[PDB]
Amino acid sequence: FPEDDEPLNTVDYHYSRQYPVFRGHRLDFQLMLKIRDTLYIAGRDQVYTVNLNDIPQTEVIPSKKLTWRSRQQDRENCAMKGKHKDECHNFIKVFVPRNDEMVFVCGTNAFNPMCRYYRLSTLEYDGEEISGLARCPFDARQTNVALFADGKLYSATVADFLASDAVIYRSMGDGSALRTIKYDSKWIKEPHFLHAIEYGNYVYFFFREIAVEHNNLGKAVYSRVARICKNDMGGSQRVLEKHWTSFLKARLNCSVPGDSFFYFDVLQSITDIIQINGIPTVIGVFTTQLNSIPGSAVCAFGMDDIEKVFKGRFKEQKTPDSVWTAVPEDKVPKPRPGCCAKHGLAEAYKTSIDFPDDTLSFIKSHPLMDSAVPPIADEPWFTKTRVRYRLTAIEVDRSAGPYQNYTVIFVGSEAGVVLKVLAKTSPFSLNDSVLLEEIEAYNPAKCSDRKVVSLQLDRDHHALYVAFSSCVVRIPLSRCERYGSCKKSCIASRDPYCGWLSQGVCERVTLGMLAGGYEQDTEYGNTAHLGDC
Amino acid sequence: FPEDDEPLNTVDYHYSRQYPVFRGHRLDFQLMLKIRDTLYIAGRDQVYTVNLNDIPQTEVIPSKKLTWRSRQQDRENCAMKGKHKDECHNFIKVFVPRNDEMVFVCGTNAFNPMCRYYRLSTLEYDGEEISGLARCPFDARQTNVALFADGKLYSATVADFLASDAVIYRSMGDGSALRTIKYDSKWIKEPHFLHAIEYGNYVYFFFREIAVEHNNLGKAVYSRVARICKNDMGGSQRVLEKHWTSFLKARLNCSVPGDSFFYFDVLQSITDIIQINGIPTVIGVFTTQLNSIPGSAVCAFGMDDIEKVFKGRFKEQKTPDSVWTAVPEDKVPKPRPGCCAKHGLAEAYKTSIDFPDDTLSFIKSHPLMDSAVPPIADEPWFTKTRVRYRLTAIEVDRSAGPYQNYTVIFVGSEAGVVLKVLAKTSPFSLNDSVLLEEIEAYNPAKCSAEEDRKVVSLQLDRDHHALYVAFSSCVVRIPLSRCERYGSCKKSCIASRDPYCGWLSQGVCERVTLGMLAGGYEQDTEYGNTAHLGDC
């Protein structure tokens, strides 16, 4: 079992108090999204715009802003239902561009979810309100997912005021209004939706939920990745009518090997598809259970490894007192459940309504796969145990350093501790993943509660925006400033962003000179023939 | 899920180095036993006697000594046995008094375990040798158990030089030589025996072993409390010839509740029967798995609940790929398996051989109970999670304080640290457990002269207000209270909340064991009220 690595460098508040924050009267940060050279930040009643080329002086000021508050009658209705007015606000929870000019923005609107269209360049409300049912949650403490694929919006949230109908929904475009089965613990059980990606012929979802492979034990939570077809048209007139015909979910296996594997089963966040040395990869942050000893880790799963688990066996529970087992291959119907029509094995079907009742009623009671998704190298890329907090947010620089052939990973924490890790992704690389720097990003004087929410890499401007429930802080990716001319300090920090120069000092690799001009040893860090400055 | 408490006070080295250490080429400590005011320390080749009435001046000086080095041919045969010369020594692994005059002593003898009888008064070889097979281990690095109950000795160890046949065994009596079924993975699978206790009509064993219920999952480790009957003599000629007809084992449940129970199932050490709040309980140290996040806890189980667990239903695996579930109460054969003959539900059967064969062949294929022994007061009595090390040894003072109504637990560690914890036992007591002091015990100057500082065992010298922390090469006498650390500062006194210390009108607070009336010592062990007390 690994041990907590020692941070090669630390950055306390006093070393980070010299950094600008955003407040804008609570911010109530909900999400953020970067397009080209502009970062939108969605909180309570407002959506701010920040020019990433505008380098701040006193404080990052919003270039523009979007105002949309709940009409007073909405607030009075939210009060009549019996919820406190602090929740009776229009917390912007959905902000997804449909094309290169308009954006779909959904807010909770005092527990009456609504949706509108705005223009990106001018933040102009051009149009009117689409209802927000099954697209924006009623509560701001919930998570939610919203994605656009070929014109159709795939959402994931709750659809009722009582917060009981957790659902994956799809609408808009030129298809049909599909959804999961209401109150069907076999399909999804008290989940917390996190992320979603569009790959191949499918759209994958990433969430966590109460596990049914542990129903004889406790209410343990597993990490699931679900999958649906883009061209899903629905079930036949008697089976799966107005429901999904390819909803397949599998388990993600973030574990430490040995004689008794240790599993990080709770998922806190994940990235999009990142090209990590030739192959597409998704990198997730997994902590342990609630009532457990807080430990966290960072696993990475490939997209071929995730497509294979769905090409595998299904999982069933024959008797109520038997262990969940794999369904034999000669007992699964035809065509191959989960395959999309007009593709591969189901190419003899042009619509999902022509699907037989043999296959559609099978996937209705066997939606869980048998295999679990293994990570690469079969061991996490980083872990953190001996501390009192859990890691949350995540972002990755796939190309770091002068030759941009190194991967860096930035993770959040429940206590505003953003960790920067040089990660090992290939056999021929390091010996272990090196925690380069540990930063205290929370700004008690500037902010206000110190749980990192999300991280946004600004690679071109060499920055990382760290989110909290009341502030966003711009932290430089590097800190070669503090090592200065102490050539040791810089080489012994092993930072790929920092490079030493003949001019007698060590600075960022994004300065202007050739890659060969910078000198460093991020691999080993050979301190030979040097002095303690 | 709670969190680690903060030490009210910490005793560092440069304070603890003002304490005497015992040293007796190393020592290779193995065990220690307290008889009245005498302590027997058993290590390699030798057995030391120290008088708990002799206040040390510079070093713990042993009074009497017993020597027992191995045979000349047992050094060089053990040389032929591949074993290193350091391993080829007579490590005393068993030292148990049979009566109040002589003692059974078993040693490894360079992987040729043998037993003898000595006299406590003289430590003289006043007997003749006995073979230590199934009684004393071949290897010193392993654990073992030995106990005398009703004339006979009940051992539990390994029996072969290759360390494969683990066995619970009985001898030194009028019957034959009973033992567990060798290689029966459903009876015993790779265990580490830790303790045994005679209670009622049974001898209960306490150990840990690879779980049979995690056959599908990983090689987990479950903590087992087993039990055998004392009047057992074996089965009939047909089934279980020269074997136990009452071997019943249950699982120990050290659990933090909630929507996802957190379990400590690796047993490290345990105590004997201690009367807590009126009922006999047993207190034990559990830790998480090896390949897990290091955490540890202190749980307490009442004997009544253990018996209620053993009077319950058995556990079976109906299908290879199914969950272990209970056996119906109509399918349990008569007489009640596990019950001792001449008692309760076997009052008619006068001997375990009069038993049938369906009952035996049932108890032969169902040695594992279904229920798990619940811990007292749901959540564990103590927890330690954020540290890099695991707890080990355990000792308990059940009558701390000037009124002797407080339970103070001392727990070892893998890094020479000892934790003193006033435990919350009954509801109408504390709010939660209070770890008063954290004592660094390992003495780098004396305890070594290689750096391994694993606490092995502890012994409570309540009659002399001490605690002999044991290591692999030293024993450190450690008082139960440094009431001198506070003295003048009433704030520091009531702030440590130690029941061993109390405040006096003389302006200095002291050990409550000084000879004055109980109503004279002022303290507040229920809250820690530093109100209206100046910061001295």
Ligand SMILES: *[C@@H]1O[C@H](CO)[C@@H](O)[C@H](O)[C@H]1NC(C)=O
């Ligand atoms: C998790 O992955 C490891 C290696 O990738 C594998 O050995 C282990 O069996 C997996 N566990 C499960 C439950 O699939």
Ligand SMILES: *[C@@H]1O[C@H](CO)[C@@H](O)[C@H](O)[C@H]1NC(C)=O
């Ligand atoms: C441990 O004991 C608690 C009650 O103290 C009980 O709820 C739990 O189920 C027990 N654990 C097992 C594995 O039976």
